[PDB]
Every structure is written in C-alpha cells, then in structure tokens.
Design a protein around this ligand. Structure first.
Ligand SMILES: [Mg+2]
Ligand SMILES: [Mg+2]
Ligand SMILES: [Mg+2]
Ligand SMILES: [Mg+2]
Ligand SMILES: [Mg+2]
Ligand SMILES: [Mg+2]
Ligand SMILES: [Zn+2]
Ligand SMILES: [Zn+2]
Ligand SMILES: [Zn+2]
Lengths: 36, 229, 129, 175, 61, 146
RNA sequence: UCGCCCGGUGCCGUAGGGAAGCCGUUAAGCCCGCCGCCUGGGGAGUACGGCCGCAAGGCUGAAACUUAAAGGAAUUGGCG
RNA sequence: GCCGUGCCUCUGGCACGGCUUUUCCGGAGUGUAAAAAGCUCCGGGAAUAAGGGCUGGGCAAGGCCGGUGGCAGCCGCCGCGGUAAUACCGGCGGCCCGAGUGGUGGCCACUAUUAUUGGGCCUAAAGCGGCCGUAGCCGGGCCCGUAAGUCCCUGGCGAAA
C-alpha cells in the first residue's frame, strides 16, 4: 500500500494497523455502490 | 607607547610567582612574548601575559562577543547562570578566546577576560590573493579552514582596501589579530556564536600547520607574531 | 574492479605521508605514473625512486620527505587553452603560485608553469601542493 | 529583446541601519557640508570603480591589457589624485577623503576665496567663481590639476573689487 | 623591528616539520652524547617513531 | 552510498536528465511552470480589484487572543465571485455601507496568504466610493454619496 | 599444547569522521565507478485514469485547501 | 539663503547690523519655418518654495504626559492590551531618507532549499525483500601505425545599435 514508517509512531494519533483497516472499508464501498 | 610600560613595572614587583615559567619571567631569563610558545610549557598564571604583552588589557584590545543566561530545574525553582564569551589581543599578532561563567554579569565577565589570556596563540599574516600581489601583512597568506561543532569556516585572501567581508562576529576576532582584508565561505549553523567563534579561532590557529619552503616567504610576506610594531 | 592506476597511487601517497611513513610501494606501475613522479621530484616533493621488476608489470619504491600537504587526481581530465589556466588554479590551489598543476601537453607531461612559457595546453591529469 | 535603459550611477547601502556606518557617514557630511546622502554615495562609487579596475589589470597579461593599464595611471594622476612617480599598486591605497578634496566647493574654500564652507556653495551656485575663463555653477565638479591655479572671481561680479563690504570680511580671516 | 633573524622556529628531528605554538612536544639533551638538543613533535611521540642524534649514531627511544 | 552517479566524461545526457527529473519534486518550480495559481485565483493576476459590498460581518480572533475583527463581503465585478475582506483602522466599519463600491488589495502575509490572528481573511479594503479609507478614518476628508 | 600465513565470525581501541548516541582494516575514514531514491507538517498513499489477479488485493499516483512548526540525539528535575 | 556680534535649552532658536540673486516678477537682444523654451544683459526684492514613514526585538531612535480597559485596536515573523501599556489612540521630544516617501502583485539574490563547480539516504525526508542480465555510462601492463576527439599558428565569416 506504499506506507511510510513515520506513522507507526503513535505520539499524537491512533494506531495505523487500524487506520489501514478503515481506509480499506471505504475503498470497498466506493467500488460496489456504483463504482462503475 | 609608555602608559602600558609602567604597568609592566608595577606588576612585576608585587607578584610572587608560583610556577616555573613565572620564576623565569621574574628572574629576567625570559624577556619576550615570542619565547614561551613552541616548547610545551604550560601557562597557568595570567600575569605571565600582563608583563610580557601589557597592552592586552587596554579596553580597546578587549571584547565581549555575547552574554547568555541559562537555567537548571529543581524542586525549588530555576537555578540561573551566565555565560560570557570574550576575546583579547594586541592588534599585531596575538589572540585569545575564552568563556567563563558566574551567577552575575560582572563575575562572569571577569572570568571570561581572565581565561582569554591563558588560551592565547600566535599566527601568520601575509598576502596571498591573485588581485593584490603586494607583500604586506594585512590578510591571510593562503586559504585555511577550521571547524567546531556543526560550523565549517573557510577564509580566502583578498585585496588591499576591501573590508573584512565575513559575518557579524568574525570581524571582532579577525581584527584583534591584526587582519584587515579577507573573504569567506561558511556551512553549518552560524547562529550559535560559540561554535562560530571557535571555528574562526581554529582557522587562525591552523594558519601555522601548512608546510612552506623558504622561497614562499619572500613572495607572500609571511610574518609570525609582531611585524615591526 | 580496477579502473585507474594513477588515482590509486596519489591517494596512497597522501594517505601514507599523513601518518608519518617514509617509504611507499606503488604497485601497478605504468609509465605515466613514472612520468608524474619525475615532475613531483624536480619541484622537491619526494626523494628518489626506482623501478623494480617482478614479472607482472613491476613496482615502484619511493621515499617520502614529509613535504606535501595534499595530492590527488583531476579525474574527468578536462582540456585547457593556453590562456585559461588561472581559472583552474583558482579552483584547486590555495594562493597565486602555491604548488603545481600537472598537464598532459602534446610534448609530454609537465607543470602548468612550463606550459605557459611555451604557450600550449592539454589535459589536466593531477595536482600537487 | 528589450532596448537600452538608462541606469543609476550610484549604489545604496546593503542594510540601511548599521550603527557603526551611520556614525562614520555623519562625520563626512558635516565636514564637507554635502546636501543629502545620494551626493555622498556617488563619490564612493567613483572610487570603487577605479579600485575594481586596478584589480583586473593586475592579474591580467597580454597586448592590449598593457595599453589599458597605463591609461588608468595617466588619467588618475591627471586628476590630481596620484603623484608623478606612482606605480599601479598605489591605486589600491586610495581613500574616500581624497576624492572629496577635489570638488570645486572644497577647493574654492581651501584657496581663501570664501570665509567658510557653506558660503562657498553660495558663491558657486550664484555664479561668482570662474574656472579657466568660464563660469561654472555646480559645486560637485571635480577640478583637474592643470587648472587648480587659474581660479578667481568672475570679471563681472561685485566681488571683483577690493572694496566690497563682503569681500573685506573674507580677507579679514587670511593671516 | 630589528629583523636580523629575530628568531627561528624549531623542527622535529625525525620528520622535519616545524612545531605549532601549543602542542605537547618536548626537548632534551642527547643521551649518550650530551652535545645535541633533540625535538619530538606530538605525532612522533604518540606513535613511537625512532630518532637518531645528528652527532653520534645512538638511535631510538 | 557510492560516489555520485554520472561523473563520466561522455555522460552529459544522463546528468542533464537526472537534474530535470528531480527538479519536479520542488514546489516553487512546479507551481510556476504548470501555472497553478491562476485557474484557481479570484483576482486573476491583478494587484487590485473592485467590488460591491453585500453584508457586514465580524470574526473571532485566534486562541491566545480575544476580540472581534470587522469585515465585509465583496462581490467582484470582473468575475462575479464573493470574497471576504478586512477593514483596517479604528472605527472604519462605520464608513462602509451596503451598495458601496470598494477597492481590494492583498493583506500581505506569508506566501501571499493571511496574516496574524485573522486567519481566513486574505484581502483588505483601501478605497470607498473613490475616496481613500485612511483619510476618512482620521478626519481630514469627507465621504461622498451620503 | 605453542608460534606463523590465508579466508569467515565477535569484542576493547589509536588517527580520522559525526549534531550527538557512537562507527573505527567486517568504517558511518581518504579516494576511483555505476544504478535506485529525498526536498516543511497534513490533505494522502487518498480521488481520477491504466495494467495485472478467480476474488481478497498488488503496482503507478496528483491537486483545491489548511498549518509554524512537525521531527532527531543528549541534559536538570518531577514522577511510576 | 549667506556673513559678523551678542543671549539661551548650545547639534540649534532668537535680537540687532550688512551681503547676494541660482530660483521669482517686469523689460531689451539672440534664438525659432512662426512661436515657446533656453542663453547674454537691465530694474525691484530674503523676498515666492518641505513632505512621507517610522519610534518593544530583528533595526537607527523615549522608561516622558493624558486617554482606553482582553473592550476598541496593533501584528511580514516573534508577540502587545484584563484599571500602574516604553508595543493601541492623541500631545511634546527624537531617528532614517529627502522632491519624494509608504502600500499590494511578479522575477533574481538570500538558498549548498536543485548542488557540473557544490547537498543528502543507521537513529531526523530517503537503499528496490533478494539475486540474474539486454542497451547505455565506466574499464589492467608493454610495443608499432592512423590522426577522428584534443592543443598551437594562419585565411573567410558571426550587420548597426
Ligand atoms: Mg506615540
Ligand atoms: Mg536600538
Ligand atoms: Mg540537505
Ligand atoms: Mg526514515
Ligand atoms: Mg590504458
Ligand atoms: Mg556588432
Ligand atoms: Zn596584499
Ligand atoms: Zn616530528
Ligand atoms: Zn647523540
């Protein structure tokens, strides 16, 4: 997914393993719900 | 040139020397500034310099480069400290740079000025530029460079009449040593004046590590220490 | 692999003399290497040198005097006109006659100070000071 | 491309508020009584161009560079700024107060024709002096050497009579 | 200022490189002879390089 | 890392290409060659513009501050856009009335953006009804058209 | 069991380099080569297009706008 | 505007005496295709002629007085204001340029923040997960030729501004 290790640093954010999983769900909804 | 020659006589009498060099200077065995250096002695009394180079404390051969105040934390507040950076030198061939600390601005300046005298060095001057080919001790005889911390400094010879085109603090140091014309090229962070000052000091010291033949001397005008006061 | 037997020599010389050595061995020995040693000698930078044959291209023994600050190779080997020397002398050397700049002129190898007397040019190969 | 533009013949300072320089220029303006600052930077530039010329004919060598070398000495001493024995290396130790000494104002004052320095300006601007049989009305004019002795009052000026009430206050200072 | 060779600068007796103002050099009279003064620069003392007296032949540290 | 990539004598083409390739990782150059400022700019490469005011508003200042800065909504003439502009001076807003023509300059901030504690505003008013505003604020001149 | 030469694998360490932590002939030293990538923090590894995969997914990859700091190596304390 | 002498806060302001006429008003020549400007001469008169921005640090200049009270407002950046403001608004002092002096937009330097001269890639942005190889760039020692690259001398050219 071409990610950058600056974001696994957790200081003022949430975890990135869990932002990935949430971007993937939207990239799905834009695909099925008439992504054609 | 006398007002600083009764100062020498006054100090040379009520001073009880405690090291070997002091004994030598008091017994008249050592009688010129130029013969305490290239021998591996140690200089721990400031009165070796108030007697051999008396005009180093002339209030226009002195300079206070910066004053800062710094802090350390404790369960009862902030403990504050000063930091003065000072340089001294006769404008003929000799320069020194020291720092010194204290709780007040007055004690800190005294220690700065004191330690500047013990960290003194002598240099070489000449004329090595392509434009001005005179033979006069007014600039640096060739390209030299020195470093400190994160600052890199280079000095290049320049023609007679051009000012000293270097930063804001380099002028004081380079002018107390006797130079009057130069060019410059810098890298690193020049806004930490301690490291910038110590880089310029290191360059002026490195002036005398370059191997040179006896024919270059009567081509660039190289003088060491005083050059006909 | 190996690409330049002259650069290796000049870096070896300036690395050895900086720690105090008094003899070096320039292993792969061209005759360009020998020709540049010849002009590093006449200006008083090295002592005496000899060519030892070992069956495979020969070696060079050279004694140092501790009289050089820096030596190196001008690599891309630019060409110079016979009236454009100062532009390069202001880039490599530290004052207006400090040291030599070695030039591969059409009449052999020589320092730029003897090229300007005949008024010729060529490729710059190295510099010593 | 674009055609020729006419350019300024002086240069301003790089920073406008350096203390050790405002202090140095505040003296040259009261001693010679120049009108504004742009009148002072013009003379600095007149000197810096000479200096920058001597730096190039000093490294250079060739046939015509020689010819350009000895045209700089010839004029530079025709203007009174060098003596008749000077070599090229003496161009590099020339000062600003050497060019400020050649204005017509300072010369008509250093010859006793005016009582002070702010009066010589009026004598020049109102047209009483003359330079070589010729009224000139510009105080910043640089006087050459072959004619710094042929300077008087105009033939048709009230000052050209040693009985004027205002000329009699001028020679009252020369003793 | 009365320049009749006002002074000279000392050189190391092993490499011939003159000595900078504030380094940890040394000098002493030649052991075994007593007639020559011997100089050693800081970098020839640090890596123990041999010297030899210019009068007799006594060598090394 | 090694020495540096194309340091050969007959490698001019590759060296020029590497430079032209990495010059596009810039932002002052890409933005000057693709001309991205125009095509998104309500004033269209002008130093000034003119509009007609729709309503008068008040903005809240930044966090380590307090107070309300007065401004107006201008409706440009060459475009038809609607921008938000700031009225500089002590009591200036009492001289701006609706259905007035105003002249608009930038506000002079970093990179051309905004300045200080008024964070979203990027224009300021200079002239009202062909009469400068600076004068009106300090007496010295009277406002035409009522 | 001891000594030596060549090639691998570890540690303490001179000169030197570095912002320091520390590297130091198994370099992060001084040189000669070739290729790949970087250009303040976010928006964003996103939108739009293309090529692969049975799908999950991989690879390529901007701008409107917004912000004055975001990052690193070490000090004195306060605390668990 | 200049000069002289006195008084005072002394860099400048005043009171007395004198002088000049670039500029200003009248007038005669010269000038111009005709005019006008300009230039040489007469007669009056110190008479007709100084603004703009700044005043906390960067950055030259005030710890002076009256207003306003986290409200009005200032601020390129850092930062001021809560009833004791050298930072806002007025008075009076002072500083920088001066027939100019400030505001908004664009390009260059600043910037070694585009790096051939001349930057980076362990921990700060950044070495492809690893390896094989086609084009291209880089290539070991000596001897004999050629003269394309390269270097020196010389004819014809690269308009004027
Ligand atoms: Mg005020
Ligand atoms: Mg100040
Ligand atoms: Mg960088
Ligand atoms: Mg990283
Ligand atoms: Mg070969
Ligand atoms: Mg032409
Ligand atoms: Zn010189
Ligand atoms: Zn030695
Ligand atoms: Zn001996």
């Amino acid at each position: 997914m071409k990610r950058r290790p600056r974001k696994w640093k957790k200081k003022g954010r949430m975890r990135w393993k869990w932002i990935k999983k949430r971007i993937r769900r939207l990239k799905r909804q834009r695909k099925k719900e008439r992504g054609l | 040139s006398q007002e600083w020659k009764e100062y020498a006589k006054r100090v040379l009498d009520e001073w009880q020397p405690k090291t070997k060099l002091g004994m030598l200077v008091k017994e008249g065995q050592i009688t010129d500034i130029h013969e305490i250096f290239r021998k591996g002695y140690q200089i721990k009394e400031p009165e070796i310099i108030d007697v051999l180079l008396p005009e180093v404390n002339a209030r226009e051969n002195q300079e206070i480069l910066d004053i800062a105040l710094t802090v350390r934390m404790t369960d009862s507040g902030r403990r504050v400290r000063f930091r003065v950076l000072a340089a001294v030198g006769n404008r003929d061939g000799y320069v020194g740079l020291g720092i010194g600390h204290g709780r007040e601005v007055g004690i800190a300046i005294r220690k700065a000025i004191n330690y500047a005298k013990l960290n003194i060095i002598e240099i070489k001057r000449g004329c090595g530029s392509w434009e001005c080919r005179c033979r006069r001790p007014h600039s640096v005889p060739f390209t030299v460079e020195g470093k400190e911390g994160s600052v890199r400094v280079k000095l290049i010879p320049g023609p007679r009449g051009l000012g000293l085109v270097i930063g804001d603090v380099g002028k004081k140091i380079l002018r107390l040593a006797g130079i009057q014309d130069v060019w410059s090229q810098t890298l690193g962070e020049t806004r930490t004046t301690v490291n910038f000052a110590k880089a310029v000091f290191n360059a002026l010291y490195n002036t005398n590590k370059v191997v040179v033949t006896p024919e270059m001397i009567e081509r660039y005008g190289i003088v060491v220490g005083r050059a006909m006061p | 692999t190996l690409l330049d037997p002259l650069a290796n020599a000049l870096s070896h010389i300036t690395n050895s003399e900086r720690v105090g050595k008094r003899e070096v061995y320039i292993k792969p020995a061209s005759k360009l290497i020998g020709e540049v040693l010849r002009v590093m000698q006449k200006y008083g930078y090295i002592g005496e040198f000899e060519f030892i044959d070992d069956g495979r291209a020969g070696v060079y023994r050279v004694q140092l005097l501790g009289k050089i600050n820096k030596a190196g190779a001008i690599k891309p080997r630019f060409p110079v006109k016979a009236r454009d020397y100062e532009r390069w002398e202001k880039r490599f050397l530290p004052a207006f006659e400090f040291g030599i700049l070695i030039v591969s002129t059409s009449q052999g190898v020589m320092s730029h100070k003897e090229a300007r007397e005949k008024g010729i040019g060529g490729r710059l190969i190295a510099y010593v000071y | 491309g674009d055609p020729k533009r006419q350019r300024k013949k002086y240069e301003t300072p790089p920073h406008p508020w350096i203390k050790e320089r405002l202090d140095r220029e505040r003296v040259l303006m009261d001693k010679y009584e120049l009108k504004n600052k742009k009148e002072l930077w013009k003379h600095e530039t007149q000197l810096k161009n000479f200096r920058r010329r001597a730096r190039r004919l000093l490294a250079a060598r060739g046939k015509q560079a020689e010819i350009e070398r000895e045209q700089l000495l010839a004029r530079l001493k025709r203007l009174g700024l060098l003596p008749e024995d000077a070599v090229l290396d003496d161009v590099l130790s020339l000062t600003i107060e050497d060019i400020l000494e050649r204005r017509l104002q300072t010369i008509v004052y250093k010859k006793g024709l005016a009582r002070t320095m702010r009066q010589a300006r009026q004598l020049i601007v109102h047209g009483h002096i003359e330079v070589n049989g010729q009224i000139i009305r510009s105080p910043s004019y640089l006087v050459l050497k072959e004619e710094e002795d042929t300077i008087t009052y105009a033939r048709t000026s009230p000052f050209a009579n040693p009985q004027h009430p205002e000329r009699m206050m001028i020679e009252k200072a020369k003793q | 200022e009365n320049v009749e060779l006002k002074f000279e600068i000392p050189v190391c007796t092993s490499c011939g490189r003159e000595i900078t103002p504030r380094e940890h050099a040394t000098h002493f009279v030649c052991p075994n002879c007593g007639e020559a003064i011997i100089w050693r620069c800081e970098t020839c003392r640090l890596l123990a390089k041999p010297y030899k007296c210019p009068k007799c032949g006594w060598e090394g540290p | 890392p090694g020495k540096k990539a194309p340091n050969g004598e007959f490698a001019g083409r590759k060296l020029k290409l590497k430079r032209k390739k990495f010059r596009w990782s810039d932002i002052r150059y890409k933005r000057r060659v693709l001309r991205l400022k125009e095509k998104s700019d309500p004033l269209e490469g002008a130093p000034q513009a003119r509009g007609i005011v729709l309503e008068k508003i008040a903005v809240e200042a930044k966090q380590p501050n307090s107070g309300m800065r007065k401004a107006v909504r201008v409706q440009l003439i060459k475009n038809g856009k609607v921008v938000t502009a700031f009225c500089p001076g002590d009591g200036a807003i009492k001289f701006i009335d609706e259905h007035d023509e105003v002249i608009i300059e930038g506000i002079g901030g970093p990179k051309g953006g905004s300045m200080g504690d008024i964070p979203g505003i990027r224009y300021k008013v200079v002239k009202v009804n062909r009469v400068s505003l600076k004068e009106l604020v300090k007496g010295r001149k009277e406002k035409p058209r009522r």
